[PDB]
Every structure is written in structure tokens, then in C-alpha cells.
Amino acid sequence: VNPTVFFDIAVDGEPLGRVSFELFADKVPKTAENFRALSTGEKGFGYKGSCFHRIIPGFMCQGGDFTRHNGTGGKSIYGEKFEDENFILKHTGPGILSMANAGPNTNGSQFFICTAKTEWLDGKHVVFGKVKEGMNIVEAMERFGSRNGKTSKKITIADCGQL
């Protein structure tokens, strides 16, 4: 059975709500395991306390840079970067979880939650999960974004783990 992980989201330190994700370990096991382990922190580092640094309404919410907090950092449990596992799954609509990258085979820890269908990312970003519960919380987060991605309040992962 595919693992489920949760983020508890806070806005300027005030609790907003919980989002849970199904990770498609049956189709992208290496990519799913990276996200799972970073969510539990079991390797000694991970997402707890990190922020969503880029939110564009009608597009996506981006996070996972837990070392520089602005899109220039992060690392995977396999090292600084790891390969594109496969592109079996596509960006079919809101709720899709996909890896951010800076070119072929440069996955780290950064990810984005799609809030729209983003078909032009198919075959370039590895899809590895989907929102299971709390899409309404993602929609609420989206309202703190802007056209250039800067957030009007600090959106943080106050807690996270495996359900």
C-alpha cells in the first residue's frame, strides 16, 4: 500500500490546517521514498519547519528548500541530486505532486503542488504523489501567493510525518 504523509501548515505561525498526500511508491519508489523520509525527518534532516517560498495562484505552490528557504537550496536523501526516475505519471490537474528541478537529473528536495493542469511539464518533471485530504487547505494557501510568486505571509510546514 502506498504511504501517506501529512503537512500541518501554518501562516505567520498561526495554524491553518492539514494536507495529506498519497505517494505513488508503486510507480516511482525512489522518488516517493525521498519525499517520505524528508517528511519524517528520519535521516536527520527534512521538511519540518521549512517554508513554501513560491506560490502562484492558478499554477502551483512550491516548497522543500529547507537549507536556503528561497529556491536555491535543498538536498535529497541520496545526495545533492538524483536522477529522473521515470515519467509514467502526468500533470493531470490540481493536487498533483511533482519534483522541481534545474535540468535533467537534478532532483533534490524541492517540489510543487499543482493547483491547475500543467501539461507542459509532462516528461520534464517527475510526478510522484497527489493530495488525498485537505485540498481546501492548499486552496487557502494559494490566496497568500502573488503573480510573481512572493507570499504575503510566511507559509510554513509546522509539522509533518507519516500517517
UniProtKB/Swiss-Prot annotation:
Effect of residue 120 to E: Loss of peptidyl-prolyl cis-trans isomerase activity
Assigned keywords, A-Z: Acetylation, Apoptosis, Cytoplasm, Glycoprotein, Host-virus interaction, Isomerase, Isopeptide bond, Nucleus, Phosphoprotein, Rotamase, Secreted, Ubl conjugation
Phosphothreonine modifications at: 92
GO CC annotation terms, alphabetical: cytoplasm; cytosol; extracellular exosome; extracellular region; extracellular space; ficolin-1-rich granule lumen; focal adhesion; membrane
Name of the protein described by the UniProt record: Peptidyl-prolyl cis-trans isomerase A
Residues that bear N6-acetyllysine: 27, 43, 75, 81, 124, 130, 132
Annotated source species: Homo sapiens
Function: Catalyzes the cis-trans isomerization of proline imidic peptide bonds in oligopeptides. Exerts a strong chemotactic effect on leukocytes partly through activation of one of its membrane receptors BSG/CD147, initiating a signaling cascade that culminates in MAPK/ERK activation. Activates endothelial cells (ECs) in a pro-inflammatory manner by stimulating activation of NF-kappa-B and ERK, JNK and p38 MAP-kinases and by inducing expression of adhesion molecules including SELE and VCAM1.
Sites bearing Phosphoserine, chain numbering: 76
Gene Ontology MF terms in the entry: cyclosporin A binding; heparan sulfate binding; integrin binding; peptidyl-prolyl cis-trans isomerase activity; RNA binding; unfolded protein binding; virion binding
Outcome when changing residue 120 to A: 200-fold decrease of sensitivity to CsA. Reduced ability to stimulate MAPK/ERK phosphorylation
EC number: 5.2.1.8
Glycan-modified residues: 107
Position(s), cross-link Glycyl lysine isopeptide (Lys-Gly) (interchain with G-Cter in ubiquitin): 27
A Pfam family matched in the record: Pro_isomerase
Organism superkingdom: Eukaryota
Subunit details: Interacts with protein phosphatase PPP3CA/calcineurin A. Interacts with PRPF19 isoform 2 (via N-terminus). Interacts with isoform 2 of BSG/CD147. Interacts with FOXO1; the interaction promotes FOXO1 dephosphorylation, nuclear accumulation and transcriptional activity. Interacts with integrin ITGA2B:ITGB3; the interaction is ROS and peptidyl-prolyl cis-trans isomerase (PPIase) activity-dependent and is increased in the presence of thrombin. Interacts with MAP3K5.
Keyword Secreted applies: yes
GO biological process terms, semicolon-separated: activation of protein kinase B activity; apoptotic process; cell adhesion molecule production; cellular response to oxidative stress; endothelial cell activation; leukocyte chemotaxis; lipid droplet organization; negative regulation of oxidative stress-induced intrinsic apoptotic signaling pathway
Entry's family note: Belongs to the cyclophilin-type PPIase family. PPIase A subfamily.
Matches recorded under InterPro entries: Cyclophilin-like_dom_sf, Cyclophilin-type_PPIase, Cyclophilin-type_PPIase_CS, Cyclophilin-type_PPIase_dom
Cellular localisation: Cytoplasm; Secreted; Nucleus
Residues joined by cross-link Glycyl lysine isopeptide (Lys-Gly) (interchain with G-Cter in SUMO2): 27, 81
Keyword Membrane: no
Consequence when changing residue 124 to Q: Acetylation-mimetic mutant; no effect on its interaction with TARDBP
Mutation effect (residue 120 to F): 75-fold decrease of sensitivity to CsA
